[PDB]
Amino acid sequence: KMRDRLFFLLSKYGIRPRDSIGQHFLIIEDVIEKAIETANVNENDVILEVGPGLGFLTDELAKRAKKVYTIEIDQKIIEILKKEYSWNNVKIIQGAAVRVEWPKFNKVVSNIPYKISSPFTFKLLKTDFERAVVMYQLEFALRMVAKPGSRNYSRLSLMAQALGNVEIVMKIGKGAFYPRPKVDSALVLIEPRKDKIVLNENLVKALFQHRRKTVPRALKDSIHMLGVSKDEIRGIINNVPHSNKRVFQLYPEEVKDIEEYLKKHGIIS
Ligand SMILES: CSC[C@H]1O[C@@H](n2cnc3c(N)ncnc32)[C@H](O)[C@@H]1O
Numbered sequence: 001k002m003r004d005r006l007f008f009l010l011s012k013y014g015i016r017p018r019d020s021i022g023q024h025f026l027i028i029e030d031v032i033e034k035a036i037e038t039a040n041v042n043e044n045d046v047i048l049e050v051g052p053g054l055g056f057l058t059d060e061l062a063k064r065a066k067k068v069y070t071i072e073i074d075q076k077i078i079e080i081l082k083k084e085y086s087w088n089n090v091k092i093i094q095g096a097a098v099r100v101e102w103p104k105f106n107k108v109v110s111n112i113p114y115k116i117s118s119p120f121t122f123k124l125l126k127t128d129f130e131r132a133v134v135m136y137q138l139e140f141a142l143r144m145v146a147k148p149g150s151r152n153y154s155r156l157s158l159m160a161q162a163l164g165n166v167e168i169v170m171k172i173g174k175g176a177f178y179p180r181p182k183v184d185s186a187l188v189l190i191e192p193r194k195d196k197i198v199l200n201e202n203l204v205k206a207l208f209q210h211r212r213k214t215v216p217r218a219l220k221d222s223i224h225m226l227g228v229s230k231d232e233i234r235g236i237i238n239n240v241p242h243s244n245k246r247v248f249q250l251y252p253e254e255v256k257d258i259e260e261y262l263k264k265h266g267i268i269s
């Protein structure tokens, strides 16, 4: 139904779906019914969607969530909503959710596009939220859930898992979109740890400059010698926790040991 309900809004309004802003458009109901479920959206929820499009997942959010803020950037799309859909608890904004200043929200539900997967998720970790269901280009979402020491374990992996609990729920065939995307979708859940692990951002970044470096060397190299001499550092080097491991093998737990180790030696705060 939705399959055919797209096509009567397609050339009803007339956008060429550009992959300049990752315009692929979802058309499977058993994929909206799994996110909305996963999020468990009740009527006390201040939601955040991003890149609503022509809003079928936006739709479901209305008929549950308390307040839905949504952010779209194709000023054409922004309007197509208002005519095609009369919503009583919706709130659309102009801009790229990248930079625009965000409302209040406890949950998030959105298909995040390829170009803004990375900076988005980051901003999103510095926020309160009870919960986050988010759709991703598979390559990225695997990246989120990577285990320590795995092929692709990234700063993002650390940072995400440090805050919360990152489960892939369903992979999603590109057969769900017109246009068909180049790669598959996947669905990530984020439940923030009851007690977070609060890493120094700068440190985390210093280490992950070259993430396949041994901790001793990734520190040697991003020791900005912040007012510190040589015989002390190349001592302090030796005893840094996990001076075996390559940076990309570190668990968040262990980034913290290093953190306080360094802290308790005079080196960042
Ligand atoms: C979910 S289908 C893709 C949708 O995401 C929107 N989109 C792409 N990039 C951004 C962005 N930076 N901010 C907000 N919406 C975006 C596109 O305009 C399209 O409607």
Ligand SMILES: [Zn+2]
Binding pocket: 209, 210, 211, 212, 213
């Ligand atoms: Zn390197």
